[PDB]
Design a binder for this molecule. Structure first.
Ligand code: HEM
Ligand SMILES: *[C@@H]1O[C@H](CO)[C@@H](O[C@@H]2O[C@H](CO)[C@@H](O)[C@H](O)[C@H]2NC(C)=O)[C@H](O)[C@H]1NC(C)=O
Ligand SMILES: *[C@@H]1O[C@H](CO)[C@@H](O)[C@H](O)[C@H]1NC(C)=O
Ligand SMILES: *[C@@H]1O[C@H](CO)[C@@H](O)[C@H](O)[C@H]1NC(C)=O
Ligand SMILES: *[C@@H]1O[C@H](CO)[C@@H](O)[C@H](O)[C@H]1NC(C)=O
Ligand SMILES: [Ca+2]
Ligand SMILES: [Cl-]
Length: 595
């Protein structure tokens, strides 16, 4: 008999019995509970939060407060001892293209964003944390251990600001702190169109009644569109080359410029909307602007959903795919479609799949120019390498011909991310995404590794010998026991990712359960799922059946040689075919021949 959810932010709640189109915010998707899966609401709690104080303080905040009678190891020490490796040789995935890593980050970006609290935008609050490393309020610095090389070149800490939470921005009464999902839980292309009405209108071309998305006016890719620039400072994309002065891009999601291949993928998606808008005009010259936007938006939403669930999830989950995601049996309005706090950590498995280098290939799939291959760390917030060095085609070839990094228990996160991560505001290519992932776990009050094994109906090792058996690795198990003293204390991010990969998949059994459940819930609980009776026509649905990533590239770049199966390892010229031969999306069924 406890009171039900403080939602003082987001009072707006007006819904519509007609609507054949998703809202931008994802409101009104669920008729009975219409805020479920909407942006700027709490992440769902599959299990109760676990803070040191039971409310808000993360484990590792107070020196003398143990977790189950043991101090928690520093994020950065766990990073250094477990996550790091030197040798990039033999680390590549012989059966996953780099497009595999890249699609993951896109889907993640559609589903969840828990952005850091905004009580320090052009304030001397950010600097307190950076310079002086002093813990307090929303500053929760990543302190270096004794023998850390970063001590010698970077100071005592790496800065870290706690994530936004609902009813902000000082804590409340006697409910655990709940972090905001700032995008739509629905796989709805929010990353392209935005999750706020504000950003959604900005991105749109409201000059012509063609329902087009705004494209770059300052620069073109052999006639093909770039995303608009984000004319705001400080721009991190300007910071990394003040001679190029190429701003970050403006997309439906904030993080589109974080690295050059995400920006690339955002560019294909935008172009595809525009191509769809133009072809719907041809076939329906009567349709006004809004109609064209919405009818293109909804097709691209289907596209993202089909590629994710037909092509991507099966080669993530492998043998566990059908245990968790059986054939669609239609909309179930009883399902919770909200993204869970734990999913936003479970989906970070993607971090082990990022390789140390990126390549540009010519029309013969050969090194484009003399610096064709670049270290990943020089491509954080790097847009000028696209604008002033060959557009997205050389990079979209590298996404086809190059391989993802394979998860390895001995080689977890490349030093490009683990030591050389660039963050906006901060000046240096010197951060640790592994350490960030671990502090964030604690920041979100995540239950430990065994709570989540429990949740998924899996054994809970309590001994070294127990952990060895589960991880199938005596040395990794040893290092974790030395750090965490009990498997109960292991942060789910590292515990989940340390498990050996399921047959035909790229995650362990724990992550397969957590990912599997979340993707089942976003499908079965989405009123606007593409294959859900009444959303498309029977004829339209047969047209959608035919989409491929290959087609997406043929239609939206100057590439003519692609593989049939974009996510497998594919070598040129053998596994490559003429676009001429690749199933089109026939849009005839969108023609409103009748009235
Ligand atoms: C070069 C590639 C990538 C970079 C530079 C990158 C960087 C980042 C950064 C900086 C964060 C925020 C960390 C924090 O404040 O807690 C993050 C979060 C995340 N990343 Fe990545 N990432 C990359 C690739 C991927 C991939 C391939 C996936 C999945 C397949 C992925 C999934 C996630 C998820 C799920 C989150 C949490 C998002 C949220 O709800 O806030 N990332 N990434
Ligand atoms: C900043 O960007 C500029 C280009 O905008 C880079 O310089 C092209 O770079 C190389 C020379 O190193 C040549 O291929 C071109 O002739 C350059 N053009 C110009 C106008 O310089 C420069 O290297 C970048 N700097 C960094 C630190 O990345
Ligand atoms: C590669 O993965 C595919 C699924 O993408 C699978 O059907 C096949 O067994 C694998 N091929 C090789 C060469 O191992
Ligand atoms: C809007 O569309 C018109 C017609 O295609 C075009 O001329 C104009 O540049 C577009 N504006 C933007 C900002 O994309
Ligand atoms: C709908 O969802 C609930 C809870 O997930 C489940 O118990 C119920 O049986 C479902 N019904 C169908 C037809 O899937
Ligand atoms: Ca979404
Ligand atoms: Cl290189």
């Amino acid at each position: 008999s406890w009171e039900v959810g403080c939602g003082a932010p987001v009072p707006l709640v007006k819904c519509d019995e007609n609507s054949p189109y998703r809202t931008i915010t994802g409101d009104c998707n669920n008729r009975r509970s219409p805020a479920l899966g909407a942006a700027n609401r709490a992440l769902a709690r599959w299990l109760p939060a676990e803070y040191e104080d039971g409310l808000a303080l993360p484990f590792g905040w107070t020196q003398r407060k143990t977790r189950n009678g043991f101090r928690v190891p520093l994020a950065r020490e766990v990073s250094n001892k477990i996550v790091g490796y030197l040798d990039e040789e033999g680390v590549l995935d012989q059966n996953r293209s780099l497009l595999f890593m890249q699609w993951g980050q896109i889907v993640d970006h559609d589903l969840d964003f828990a952005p850091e609290t905004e009580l320090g935008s052009n304030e001397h609050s950010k600097t307190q944390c950076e310079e002086y490393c002093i813990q307090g309020d929303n500053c929760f610095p990543i302190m270096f251990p004794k023998n850390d090389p970063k001590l010698k070149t970077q100071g005592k800490c790496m800065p870290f600001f706690r994530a936004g939470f609902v009813c902000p921005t000082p804590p409340y009464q006697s409910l655990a702190r709940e972090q905001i999902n700032a995008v739509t839980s629905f796989l709805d292309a929010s990353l392209v169109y935005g999750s706020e009405p504000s950003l959604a209108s900005r991105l749109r071309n409201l000059s012509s009644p063609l329902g087009l998305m705004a494209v770059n006016q300052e620069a073109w890719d052999h006639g093909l569109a770039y995303l608009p620039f984000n004319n705001k400072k400080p721009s991190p994309c300007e910071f990394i080359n003040t001679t190029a002065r190429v701003p970050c891009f403006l997309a439906g999601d904030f993080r589109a410029s974080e690295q050059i291949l995400l920006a690339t993928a955002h560019t294909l998606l935008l172009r595809e909307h525009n191509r769809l808008a133009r072809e719907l005009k041809k076939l329906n010259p009567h349709w006004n602007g809004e109609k064209l936007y919405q009818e293109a938006r909804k097709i691209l939403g289907a596209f993202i959903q089909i590629i994710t669930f037909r092509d991507y999830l099966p080669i993530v989950l492998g043998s566990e795919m059908q245990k968790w995601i059986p054939p669609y049996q239609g909309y179930n309005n009883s399902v919770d479609p909200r993204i869970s706090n734990v999913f936003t950590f479970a989906f970070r498995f993607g971090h082990m799949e990022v390789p140390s280098t990126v390549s540009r290939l010519d029309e013969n799939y050969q090194p484009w120019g003399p610096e064709a291959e670049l270290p990943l760390h020089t491509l954080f917030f790097n847009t000028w390498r696209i604008i002033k060095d060959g557009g997205i085609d050389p990079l979209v070839r590298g996404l086809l011909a190059k391989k993802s990094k394979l998860m390895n228990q001995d080689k977890m996160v490349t030093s490009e991310l683990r030591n050389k991560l660039f963050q906006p505001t901060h000046k240096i290519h010197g951060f640790d995404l592994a350490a960030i992932n671990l502090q964030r776990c604690r920041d979100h009050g995540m239950p430990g590794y065994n709570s989540w094994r429990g949740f998924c109906g899996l054994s809970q090792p309590k001994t070294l010998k127990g952990l060895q058996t589960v991880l199938k690795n005596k040395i990794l198990a040893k290092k974790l026991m030395d750090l965490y003293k009990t498997p109960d204390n292991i942060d789910i991010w590292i515990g989940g990712n340390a498990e050996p990969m399921v047959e035909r998949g790229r995650v362990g059994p724990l992550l397969a359960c957590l990912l599997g459940r979340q993707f089942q819930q976003i499908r079965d609980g989405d009123r606007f799922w593409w294959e859900n009776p009444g959303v498309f026509t029977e004829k339209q649905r047969d047209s959608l059946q035919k989409v491929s990533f290959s087609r997406l590239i043929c239609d939206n770049t100057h590439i003519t040689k692609v593989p049939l199966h974009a996510f497998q390892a594919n070598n040129y010229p053998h596994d490559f075919v003429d676009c001429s031969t690749v199933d089109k999306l026939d849009l005839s069924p969108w023609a409103s021949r009748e009235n």
